[PDB]
Design a protein around this ligand. Structure first.
Ligand SMILES: [Cu+2]
Ligand SMILES: [Cu+2]
Ligand SMILES: [Cu+2]
Ligand SMILES: [Cu+2]
Length: 490
């Protein structure tokens, strides 16, 4: 297996605008096939990257900055990963979703708004080449990634992911670590062949060939596009924007010297109060805004470790490892940053997760026993607030993402699975559990654990129109755990 911690952690450069005035910022981003060495000991890997980079460039904007992005397809006309033609016209379709954006519906990256090379052919919901991001929302870690119908798992695995940070000037007074000491960490698990080519399975364990798989667990962990990298840090406080950009894998992170993280933010921005954590779970598309205080660790080498299984227990030599901090950089200036505790102050619908079998015996995961193409049923009115009760009788956790909105977590409550099977009665096995401090703020991708009812509160606005909601395990999303969500407007 590849030798750990021999490549320095890359820091993606921040995208520079094509045009910027005091009232509008314009960017162009092209998806290109490219080659990058993912590890010292590998030949370069064929990838698809935004602007030919993996991950794509970090996009930085200010709250309320009026942003326009022309996303363009410069990719080949055929895929290099295995395409399953049975889960449903050009083979390569792309569309960019700004994950967490408060975005008008025609710029949200609707899965059927895809386009092929040079916009030659486009999906039924395609309407505009330049997307509009008003950024009228709390400061937060967003990220952007491909979202094309029936291809999202492949296009994201190919490398189509990157970071997008909303800075709110009103948070500067908190004096959290900034500039060189504010570092995105985009975590992606991969399986890589000896010749450096990406491996993605074409079959699970009659079946069509290739065939979609129900889950993908990569053999190797990458951060910002390098296998098991190291980062040299100064003995001081850093801010890290941790993004799970993996297809399926959930991480449970910790530092092997016993140190603690300080969580300051979740998907939807700063928490009300920061929280000291020895470990934390991060499912696909979740984000954790954290501070790590390296002051007392000068000279140490610290491993960011992982304890969560993916199809089995972690391997201490491989996926138990994420990256390595080396506290050996000399202080370049006094640490003037802070870690405050106080940070800020801030209809019902039942939905069922379930899994059926298709004509090949393969599992199909569904929201409310509906298929993507069935007539829309989630149709809240613009400006209204709802409590969604998400029932999970499956054996695993599903990370549920709603577009446009962020929401508060109300509680989780365990129920009797076997009973729910027979009669559909919710026989509760214990009292409701309010969210821990990590979930007392705003979320947009939330872990619905097995055997539990999860309640979230969301206000459906400011915009109206056709969005989606779905599980963010990409293998589930593509077959077929995604539904349209219509926010109706008089
Ligand atoms: Cu997403
Ligand atoms: Cu989204
Ligand atoms: Cu799922
Ligand atoms: Cu989505």
């Amino acid at each position: 297996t590849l030798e750990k911690f021999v490549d320095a952690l890359p820091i993606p450069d921040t995208l520079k605008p094509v045009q910027q005035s005091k009232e509008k910022t314009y960017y162009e981003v092209t998806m290109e096939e490219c080659t990058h060495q993912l590890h010292r000991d590998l030949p370069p890997t064929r990838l698809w990257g935004y602007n030919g980079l993996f991950p794509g460039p970090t996009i930085e904007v200010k709250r309320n900055e009026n942003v326009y992005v022309k996303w363009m397809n410069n990719l080949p006309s055929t895929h290099f990963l295995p395409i399953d033609h049975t889960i449903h016209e050009p083979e390569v379709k792309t569309v960019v979703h700004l994950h967490g954006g408060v975005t008008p519906d025609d710029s949200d990256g609707y899965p059927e708004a895809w386009f092929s090379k040079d916009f030659e052919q486009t999906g039924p919901y395609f309407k505009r080449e330049v997307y509009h991001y008003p950024n009228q929302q709390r400061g937060a870690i967003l990220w952007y990634h491909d979202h094309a119908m029936a291809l999202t798992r492949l296009n994201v695995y190919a490398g189509l992911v990157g970071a997008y940070i909303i800075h709110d000037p009103k948070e500067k007074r908190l004096k959290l670590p900034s500039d060189e000491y504010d570092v995105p960490l985009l975590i992606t698990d991969r399986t890589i062949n000896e010749d450096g080519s990406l491996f993605y399975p074409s079959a699970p364990e009659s079946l069509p060939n290739p065939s979609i798989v129900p889950a993908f667990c990569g053999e190797t962990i990458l951060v910002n596009g390098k296998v098991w990298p190291y980062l040299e840090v100064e003995p001081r406080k850093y801010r890290f924007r941790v993004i799970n950009a993996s297809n399926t894998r959930t991480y449970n992170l910790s530092l092997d010297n016993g140190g603690d993280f300080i969580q300051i933010g979740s998907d939807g921005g700063l928490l009300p109060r920061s929280v000291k954590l020895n470990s934390f779970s991060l499912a696909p598309a979740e984000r954790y805004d954290i501070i790590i205080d390296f002051t007392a660790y000068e000279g140490e080498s610290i491993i960011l470790a992982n304890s969560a299984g993916c199809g089995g227990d972690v391997n201490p030599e491989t996926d138990a490892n994420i990256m390595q901090f080396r506290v050996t950089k000399p202080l370049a200036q006094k640490d003037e940053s802070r870690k405050p505790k106080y940070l800020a102050s801030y209809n019902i619908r039942t939905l069922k997760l379930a899994g059926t079998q298709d004509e090949y015996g393969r599992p199909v995961l569904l929201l409310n026993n509906k298929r993507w193409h069935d007539p829309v049923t989630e149709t809240p009115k613009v400006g209204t607030t709802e409590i969604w009760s998400i029932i999970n009788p499956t054996r695993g956790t599903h990370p549920i993402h709603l577009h446009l909105v962020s929401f508060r977590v109300l509680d989780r409550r365990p129920f009797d699975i076997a009973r729910y099977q027979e009669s559909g009665e919710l026989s509760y096995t214990g009292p409701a559990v309010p969210p821990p401090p990590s979930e007392k703020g705003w979320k947009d991708t939330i872990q619905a654990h097995a055997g539990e009812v999860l309640r979230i509160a969301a206000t459906f606005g400011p915009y109206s129109g056709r969005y989606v909601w779905h599980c963010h395990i990409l293998e589930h999303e593509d077959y077929d755990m995604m539904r349209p969500m219509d926010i109706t407007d008089p």
